[PDB]
Write a protein that binds this ligand. Sequence first.
Ligand SMILES: Nc1nc2c(ncn2[C@@H]2O[C@H](COP(=O)(O)OP(=O)(O)OP(=O)(O)O)[C@@H](O)[C@H]2O)c(=O)[nH]1
Ligand SMILES: [Mg+2]
Lengths: 171, 1016
Amino acid sequence: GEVPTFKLVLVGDGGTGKTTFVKRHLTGEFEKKYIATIGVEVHPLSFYTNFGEIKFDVWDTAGLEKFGGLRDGYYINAQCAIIMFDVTSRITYKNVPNWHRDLVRVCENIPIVLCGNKVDVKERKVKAKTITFHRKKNLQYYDISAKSNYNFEKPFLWLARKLAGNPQLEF
Amino acid sequence: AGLEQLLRELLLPDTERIRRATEQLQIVLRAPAALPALCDLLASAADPQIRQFAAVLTRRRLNTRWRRLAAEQRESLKSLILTALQRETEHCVSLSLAQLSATIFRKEGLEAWPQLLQLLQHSTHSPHSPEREMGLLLLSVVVTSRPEAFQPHHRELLRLLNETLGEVGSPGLLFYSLRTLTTMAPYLSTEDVPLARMLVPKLIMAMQTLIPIDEAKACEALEALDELLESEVPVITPYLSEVLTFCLEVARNVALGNAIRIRILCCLTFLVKVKSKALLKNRLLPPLLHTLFPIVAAEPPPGQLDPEDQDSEEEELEIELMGETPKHFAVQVVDMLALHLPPEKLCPQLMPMLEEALRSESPYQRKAGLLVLAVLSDGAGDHIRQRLLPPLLQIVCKGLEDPSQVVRNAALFALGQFSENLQPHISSYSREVMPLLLAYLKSVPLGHTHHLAKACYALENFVENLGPKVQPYLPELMECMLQLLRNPSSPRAKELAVSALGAIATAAQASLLPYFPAIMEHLREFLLTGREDLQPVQIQSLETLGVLARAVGEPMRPLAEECCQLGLGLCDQVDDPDLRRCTYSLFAALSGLMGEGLAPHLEQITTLMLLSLRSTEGINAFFDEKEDTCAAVGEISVNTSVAFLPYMESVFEEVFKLLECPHLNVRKAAHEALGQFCCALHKACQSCPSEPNTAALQAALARVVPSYMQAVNRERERQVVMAVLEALTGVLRSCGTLTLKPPGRLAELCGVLKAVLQRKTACQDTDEEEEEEDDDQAEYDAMLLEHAGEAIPALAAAAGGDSFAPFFAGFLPLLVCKTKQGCTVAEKSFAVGTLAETIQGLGAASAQFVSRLLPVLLSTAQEADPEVRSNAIFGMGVLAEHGGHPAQEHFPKLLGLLFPLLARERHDRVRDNICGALARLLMASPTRKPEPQVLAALLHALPLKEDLEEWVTIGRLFSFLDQVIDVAPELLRICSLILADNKIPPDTKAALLLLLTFQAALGSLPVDKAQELQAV
Ligand SMILES: Nc1nc2c(ncn2[C@@H]2O[C@H](COP(=O)(O)OP(=O)(O)OP(=O)(O)O)[C@@H](O)[C@H]2O)c(=O)[nH]1
Ligand SMILES: [Mg+2]
C-alpha cells in the first residue's frame, strides 16, 4: 500500500524525442527506426528515494495527424509537465512562448523545467546566451544528454522537491 | 448530456487505450446542424471537472463555427457566464470561466456588454470579499483580453486602482491586483497623474506575506514592476532606493530558493540600465557592496560542497557554461554595474573597500577577492592606466598557493579577462609571472583537462600580439608543453598541446628556427597519425600546419617536399565538410610556394576542390562552412602559374551564381573570392603566354568587368560597401589601360562612384526602420569615408590628359567642405592624402587646378598635429617636377612656403617631406635658388631615420652636377653621420664616393672619417 501517487504529463511537439525520452527512462536504450508517435500510453515507473520506491504516471501524448482536436484534454488535473525543444532549429525556441501561454491558460502555476534534447551532436546551434526566456519568465532549466543519460534522475528529484518542499529528499 | 458524462466519469482518471483510439466516435462526429446549446453547451451544469474541458471544446468549436450563428446566441452565453460567476465553488473553475470570458471577448470589441461595466462598479464597491476577488480576477482577465483598446477607461481603471489601494487583505486579492497591473504596464501611459503611488507599501506587504506562502508570486510581482518602467515615468525617479533596500534585506533571508536572488538582481540590473544617475546624489553604492559581499562569499547552510568542489568532475566533457548559482550571476550583475557607468572616480571610491576585500585568509575570502578582481576587470582601464598599472602582481601569485585549488582557477580566469580586455596592459610587468604560471600549471598533470583547457585559453593568447617581445621567451615555453606533448593521455591533452603549439607558432612567426629540429620529430609523429576517434586533433593539427606554412616559407623547402599527398590521402576514409575544413588552405599555400611543383598532384586536387562547392548545404549559421571553402580560391591569386586556365571556367560561372544569396556573409565571401580573379588573370598574362591566350584572357576580362560594374550602385546595404570598394580598387590596381577598352567606364563609372560617396549615397537612408534583429551597428559609415581614401587612386594615374582627366573638378567643390574649419584632424588628413594622389597622378591639366587651389593649401598652413598635411607637403614637390609651365608660373610661391617653420619641426615625417619637396623644386631646373641657406638648414636637420618612401630624392640628388660644389662639408659630415645602417635601396651606389678623387675634402677630412671609413 504505497501512498504517494503522482501523475505526470509530458508536453511537446510531435517527433521531438518524447518517445525516445520515455523509452530511455524505461530501460535505457535507443531504437533506430522513427515512428510518428500517436495517441497516448501509460508507463508506470517507480524510482528509489529516501522514502523508498515511488510510482509515477506517464502520458505519451503526441501526434498532429488526427482530424479531431483533443490535445487540450490531457492538460486537466495534471500537476507537473516537462517541455522539449530541438537545439538545431529556431522553430522550437520560438514555439516555447506558445507552449507557455497554453500551459498558463491550462493552470495558473505548475512546476515546469525547460529541457532540450539532441545535445549529443558535437556542433550546437542554440548558443547559451540565447537561452534567457526561462530566467525572465521564472522557468527552471535542466539539460538532458541523449547518450550519457545526464540528468536521468535529477529533474525528477527537482519535481520531488516541488511536490514536497522539504529539502531532505535525497536519492 | 448523459452518455458523454458517463464516458467522462471513466475516462478522466486513466482512460483506455481503445477509448484513446476511439477519438472521432468519442467526439461523436460533432455533427453541427444548428446546435444552439443542447449538443453545444451540455447545459453547462454538471460536475465542473468535466465542465472545464467542455468549455475548452466549446471555445475550439466557436473559433470557426461563427459563420451562420444567429443573433439569439450571445445574450444566452453572456447570461450563462454571469450565472457561472455567481455559481462558483472551486478556484480552478473560476479561473476557467474567467479564461472563457476573456477569450469570448475576442471580437465584437467595444460598444457591447454594459453588464461588464455594471459588474465593474459592483466589484469596486463589493463589500463582500469573495465576490470582490472574483470581480478583480474577471476584470484582470478581460483587461488581458484587450491590450490597449480601452484607452479612455484607463483613467477609470487608474481610478479603480484607488479602490484597490484601500484593502491590504487576502493574498489572492493582492495577486489579482498585481497581475492586473502586470497587463496594465504595456499600456505605456507616461502622461497620467504622477500621484499614482501607495502601491509600494502594498507590494512590500504582498511579498512579505508571500515569503512564507509562495516565492513565485513575488516573482511575477517583480517582473511586473520591471515592466512598469519603460519610459519617462514621473513618479519612479524620486523614491527608488527604499524598494531595493527592502528586496536586499529580505534576500538576507537565506531560507529561500535562489530564484529570489535571481530576480532581485535582474530587476536591479534593469533599474540600472534605465538610469543610474541617482547614486550621484546619495552614497547608495557602499551599502550595496556591503550587502553583496556576503553574497560573493556565500556559505551553504549545511556546508555542502559546491558543484565545482568535486575532485573528479569527469562529466559533461563537451561544454558546460552554467551560471545558475548565485556567485556567477552576482558577478555579472556587479560587472554590468561597473561597466554601465562612466569610470569617473567610482573605482578610487571603492578602493577603500578593495583593500578590505583583499584580506584573504579563509578560502571564501579568496574567492571574494578573485570576484572583486573579476568585476573590476572591465573594457576600460583608464583608472588603472595611471595608478598601479601592476596593481596586484603578487596577490595573483599568492593565489597560486591555494589548497582549495579553486582560487587558482579563479586567478586563471581573471588573467584571462585581463588578457582579452586590457590590450595596452598585455605589455606590462609580465617578465616573471608568466614562467612561474606555466611551471605550476604544468606541475599538475593529474588529468583534469578542464584546468588545462582554461589555462590554454587564458594563456599564450595575448603574447601573440607581441612580436618582438616573445623571442627572449623562446626556450622556456617548450619545456612547458613538452610536459604533456606526445605523452600517453586523453585526446583533449593532445588537442590542447597542438593548439598551444600553433599559438606559439603564431607568436614566433619565423623566429622558431633555434629549436625547430626538435619540433620536426613531433610534426612527423602527429602528421603520420589517424584513428576512428582522433578526428578533432587531426583537424586542428591540419590548420596549425597551415599556420606554420603561412608563417615561415622558403626555409621550409625540405619540409615542403613532403605533405603533398600524405595529408591529401587521409580524406577518403570519411566524407565530411567539417573534416574538409582548412584542408584547401594547406595545399593552396603549397601550390603558392612551389609554382609548378604541384604538377604531379595538380588534377586530383582540382577534382577534390570541385567536389566541395557543388554540395547543396546552403542551397551564427550552419552555412559558414561554405565560406571556408570559398576562402580557398582566394589563395589561388598568389601563385598558381597557368594551371587554372581550364579550371577557371569550371568554377567562376558557378561562383558567379553564388554572388546572390539572402545570407550576407556568404555574399561577402563570394565577393572577396571574385576580387582575386583580377590578380589571377593578370599573373597568368604577365607570365608570357601565346597571343591566342592573351586574346582569350582579354575576352574573359571583358566579360567579367560588367559583373563588378553592376555593383557600383545596385547594392543597397552597408556591410558589403567596404568589400566592394577594396575589391574594385584591387582589380583596378591589378590591371591598367587594358581595362579602358569599353568607353563607358571612363566617365560614367567614375561619376556614379563619386556620386555614391558622401551625400546621395544609396545606404545613407533614414526613413526606413529596423523591424528585424539589430546588431552593434556602431556607425561604421564614418570610417567608410577614410576607406574611400584608396578609391580615388585606383587607376587615377592612367589618364595624363585624357578626355576624362579633368573629372576630379566635379569632386573639387566638395573637397572644400573637407578643408573647412569644422571637421577633425582625420578628415583633414584624408582630404590632403586624396589630393596628394590626384595631383601626383596627373600633370599640367591638374597643375592648373592645384595652382588655383593653392590659396586653400596656404589656408591649411600649419595645424596642431605632428602628422597632418604632410601629403600636400610632398605634393608641392611632386607638382614641382610635374606641370612644367604651371610650375614656371609661380617661382616666388614655390620658394619659401613659410620656410621658418623648420624651427617648429617636431616630427620626422614633416621634415622629410619638406626636404624632399624642396629638393624636387631645386632640381626641377638648373636655375638660381636659395642654395647655401635652406640647403644647409635641411642638411643640418637631416637624420632621415624613417623616410621609407623618399630614398628617390636622395638618389636623384646624388651626382647631379646652376651652382657647383656648394656646401660640401655639411653633406660630407651628414653622410658620415648616417654611416652603414639597415637595409637600403639602390640609393647608396655612386654616393659621391668617386667624386672625392674634392680637393678640400681630402685635405680637410670631415671631423674624422678614418674611425670607420679608413679608405672607403
Ligand atoms: N538514428 C538515431 N538518432 C538519434 C540517436 N540519438 C539521438 N538521435 C536523434 O533523434 C532523431 C530521430 O528522429 P525521430 O525518429 O523523429 O525521433 P524524435 O525527433 O524524438 O521524434 P519522436 O519519435 O516523435 O519523439 C535524430 O534526428 C537524431 O538527431 C540515435 O542513437 N540514433
Ligand atoms: Mg523522439
